[PDB]
Amino acid sequence: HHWGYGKHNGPEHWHKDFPIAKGERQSPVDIDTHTAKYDPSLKPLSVSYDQATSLRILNNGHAFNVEFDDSQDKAVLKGGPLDGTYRLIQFHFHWGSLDGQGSEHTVDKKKYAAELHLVHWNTKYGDFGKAVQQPDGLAVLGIFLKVGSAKPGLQKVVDVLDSIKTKGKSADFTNFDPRGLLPESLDYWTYPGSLTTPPLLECVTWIVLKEPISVSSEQVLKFRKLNFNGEGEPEELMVDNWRPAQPLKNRQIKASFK
Ligand SMILES: COc1ccc(CCNC(=O)c2ccc(S(N)(=O)=O)cc2)cc1OC
Numbered sequence: 177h178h179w180g181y182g183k184h185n186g187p188e189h190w191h192k193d194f195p196i197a198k199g200e201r202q203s204p205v206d207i208d209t210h211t212a213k214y215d216p217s218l219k220p221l222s223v224s225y226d227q228a229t230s231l232r233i234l235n236n237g238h239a240f241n242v243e244f245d246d247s248q249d250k251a252v253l254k255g256g257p258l259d260g261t262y263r264l265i266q267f268h269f270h271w272g273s274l275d276g277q278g279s280e281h282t283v284d285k286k287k288y289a290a291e292l293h294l295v296h297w298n299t300k301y302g303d304f305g306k307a308v309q310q311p312d313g314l315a316v317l318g319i320f321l322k323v324g325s326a327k328p329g330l331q332k333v334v335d336v337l338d339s340i341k342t343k344g345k346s347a348d349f350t351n352f353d354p355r356g357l358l359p360e361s362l363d364y365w366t367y368p369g370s371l372t373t374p375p376l377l378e379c380v381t382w383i384v385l386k387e388p389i390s391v392s393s394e395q396v397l398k399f400r401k402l403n404f405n406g407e408g409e410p411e412e413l414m415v416d417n418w419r420p421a422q423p424l425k426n427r428q429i430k431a432s433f434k
Pocket residue numbers: 293295305308316370371372373374375
């Protein structure tokens with residue numbers, strides 16, 4: 177009886193094995209754009225992905241991860257709310273069964289079709305495993321997806337998904353450039369939060385871009401053909417792999433833009 181997104185194992189059940197699910201800085205949250213405040217203390221955000229080295233794509237039974245070589249400083253996030261350097265380790269998405277849902281964060285209660293998470297760890301802690309024992313261990317750059325025009329830079333991901341249909345399947349995935357998944361603007365909201373999947377660890381500085389990227393209907397339809405189950409198990413489409421918004425509690429969401 178593993179955690180998942182179903183009626184008997186989904187987000188309303190996670191707190192039994194992971195009591196931090198009801199903690200003080202859980203993610204995602206609704207971003208009330210009317211209560212978020214511009215923060216002039218925020219430094220310019222620097223997304224430096226030109227030397228990224230992707231390695232592999234993996235269906236882990238809850239999403240698919242594009243993994244990077246993080247053995248050296250190569251693809252890093254710094255600036256904004258962050259102190260020091262955060263190295264990219266993987267990206268993944270959350271998405272819906274229908275175009276009107278799928279994102280984890282919401283913007284004035286609006287759900288997007290999907291949400292991209294670029295996951296980074298603070299190099300002052302040496303390894304990802306040590307980083308997830310720290311309140312400032314991780315930084316996740318979140319990008320909303322809406323359905324409209326295709327995102328050309330996403331197609332190479334779309335086209336490998338047939339090789340990782342089921343849980344535990346991986347494939348080589350070298351030379352993928354995550355710069356092709358960014359929007360034009362780096363305007364963002366930031367707040368302190370958590371992983372949005374078990375173990376729900378409260379280690380994350382969230383940086384959520386305001387401008388969504390557009391993907392085509394056909395691209396997100398291919399996401400929805402993935403499976404949560406393993407090969408030769410009953411087929412459960414990998415859809416609606418999002419956690420709903422959690423209580424903001426004693427947090428303030430800051431805006432990078434006036
Ligand atoms: C060996 O030590 C660990 C290794 C990994 C983890 C956490 C695994 N989960 C994630 O890395 C992760 C989960 C959700 C996100 S999200 N959806 O918030 O971007 C990002 C990363 C926890 C660990 O320590 C228990």
